[PDB]
Amino acid sequence: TSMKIQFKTAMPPTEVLLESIQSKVESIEQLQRKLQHVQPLEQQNNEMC
Amino acid sequence: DSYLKHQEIVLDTLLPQTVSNQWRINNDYIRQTCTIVEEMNIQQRKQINDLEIYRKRL
């Protein structure tokens, strides 16, 4: 009864979140990927400096 | 997410600071190379004069 009630409440709270959060997760994770290229360009420039 | 944009901008400014300084080290080196060019070229011209003159005198 709990796995019926809570997980259907979980899947509703997840999918209402994932319609809103996975858009801003891609806003978060692709901006995290900008940091790993800004760091890799920083080291080769500091090596060349 | 707003915190991540502020962190990301700080990295880009460090990229311009290193880029400005590495250009400046190259810019100082470029003026020295051109001056070292003319000193070597004048030395070569004086040498080619001396090699020709010494055969002409003899």
Tab-separated table of C-alpha atoms in Angstrom:
chain	number	residue	atom	x	y	z
A	1	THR	CA	0.000	0.000	0.000
A	2	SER	CA	2.914	2.356	0.718
A	3	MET	CA	4.748	1.415	-2.499
A	4	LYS	CA	1.482	2.137	-4.315
A	5	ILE	CA	0.873	5.476	-2.581
A	6	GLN	CA	4.366	6.920	-2.111
A	7	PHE	CA	5.936	5.883	-5.432
A	8	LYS	CA	2.978	7.220	-7.418
A	9	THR	CA	3.430	10.380	-5.356
A	10	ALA	CA	7.167	10.112	-6.077
A	11	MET	CA	6.678	9.669	-9.851
A	12	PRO	CA	4.318	12.676	-9.842
A	13	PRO	CA	6.805	14.796	-7.880
A	14	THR	CA	9.697	13.600	-10.053
A	15	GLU	CA	8.032	14.165	-13.439
A	16	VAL	CA	6.710	17.562	-12.354
A	17	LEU	CA	10.277	18.297	-11.268
A	18	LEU	CA	11.894	16.678	-14.328
A	19	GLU	CA	9.743	18.803	-16.638
A	20	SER	CA	11.263	21.797	-14.811
A	21	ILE	CA	14.653	20.558	-13.521
A	22	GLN	CA	15.979	18.544	-16.479
A	23	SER	CA	15.676	21.702	-18.573
A	24	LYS	CA	17.773	23.545	-15.976
A	25	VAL	CA	19.962	20.477	-15.426
A	26	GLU	CA	21.001	20.901	-19.062
A	27	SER	CA	21.447	24.585	-18.239
A	28	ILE	CA	23.601	23.426	-15.317
A	29	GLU	CA	25.515	20.514	-16.861
A	30	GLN	CA	26.382	22.211	-20.165
A	31	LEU	CA	27.670	25.202	-18.204
A	32	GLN	CA	29.664	22.714	-16.118
A	33	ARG	CA	31.147	21.543	-19.427
A	34	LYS	CA	32.200	25.120	-20.190
A	35	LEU	CA	34.319	25.055	-17.018
A	36	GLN	CA	36.276	21.969	-18.111
A	37	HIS	CA	37.232	23.697	-21.376
A	38	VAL	CA	37.980	27.051	-19.737
A	39	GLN	CA	40.299	25.206	-17.343
A	40	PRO	CA	41.987	23.282	-20.189
A	41	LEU	CA	42.560	26.491	-22.156
A	42	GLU	CA	43.898	28.171	-19.000
A	43	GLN	CA	46.666	25.617	-18.415
A	44	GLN	CA	48.076	25.658	-21.959
A	45	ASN	CA	48.015	29.472	-21.924
A	46	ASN	CA	49.758	29.617	-18.535
A	47	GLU	CA	52.281	27.101	-19.875
A	48	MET	CA	52.845	29.292	-22.947
A	49	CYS	CA	53.014	32.432	-20.781
B	1	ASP	CA	22.659	28.088	-11.828
B	2	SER	CA	23.315	31.801	-11.243
B	3	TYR	CA	26.288	30.797	-9.076
B	4	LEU	CA	27.700	28.747	-11.963
B	5	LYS	CA	27.586	31.653	-14.440
B	6	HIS	CA	29.597	33.858	-12.061
B	7	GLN	CA	32.227	31.123	-11.615
B	8	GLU	CA	32.392	30.546	-15.384
B	9	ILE	CA	32.990	34.252	-16.089
B	10	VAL	CA	36.021	34.340	-13.770
B	11	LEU	CA	37.726	31.626	-15.838
B	12	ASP	CA	37.235	33.601	-19.067
B	13	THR	CA	38.893	36.679	-17.556
B	14	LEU	CA	41.919	34.565	-16.583
B	15	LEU	CA	42.071	33.443	-20.217
B	16	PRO	CA	42.322	37.098	-21.394
B	17	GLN	CA	44.963	37.970	-18.777
B	18	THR	CA	47.224	35.102	-19.867
B	19	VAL	CA	46.552	35.879	-23.552
B	20	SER	CA	47.491	39.547	-23.064
B	21	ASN	CA	50.732	38.654	-21.272
B	22	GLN	CA	51.866	35.971	-23.749
B	23	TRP	CA	51.342	38.441	-26.602
B	24	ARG	CA	53.466	40.992	-24.716
B	25	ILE	CA	56.361	38.537	-24.301
B	26	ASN	CA	56.172	37.801	-28.033
B	27	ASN	CA	55.952	41.527	-28.837
B	28	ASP	CA	59.175	42.262	-26.938
B	29	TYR	CA	60.888	39.329	-28.679
B	30	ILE	CA	59.830	40.470	-32.164
B	31	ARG	CA	61.584	43.838	-31.846
B	32	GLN	CA	64.786	42.125	-30.673
B	33	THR	CA	64.773	39.703	-33.625
B	34	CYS	CA	64.462	42.490	-36.211
B	35	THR	CA	67.380	44.378	-34.645
B	36	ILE	CA	69.420	41.155	-34.517
B	37	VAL	CA	68.568	40.737	-38.215
B	38	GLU	CA	70.117	44.048	-39.292
B	39	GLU	CA	73.254	43.512	-37.196
B	40	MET	CA	73.750	40.097	-38.809
B	41	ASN	CA	72.951	41.438	-42.295
B	42	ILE	CA	75.416	44.333	-41.954
B	43	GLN	CA	78.025	41.862	-40.679
B	44	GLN	CA	77.476	39.655	-43.737
B	45	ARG	CA	77.702	42.617	-46.133
B	46	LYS	CA	80.988	43.781	-44.574
B	47	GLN	CA	82.352	40.226	-44.815
B	48	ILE	CA	81.468	39.884	-48.513
B	49	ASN	CA	83.238	43.195	-49.142
B	50	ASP	CA	86.411	41.973	-47.409
B	51	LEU	CA	86.498	38.640	-49.271
B	52	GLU	CA	86.187	40.421	-52.619
B	53	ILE	CA	88.702	43.167	-51.740
B	54	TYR	CA	91.438	40.777	-50.543
B	55	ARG	CA	91.385	38.901	-53.856
B	56	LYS	CA	91.400	42.214	-55.757
B	57	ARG	CA	94.458	43.546	-53.903
B	58	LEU	CA	96.394	40.300	-54.430
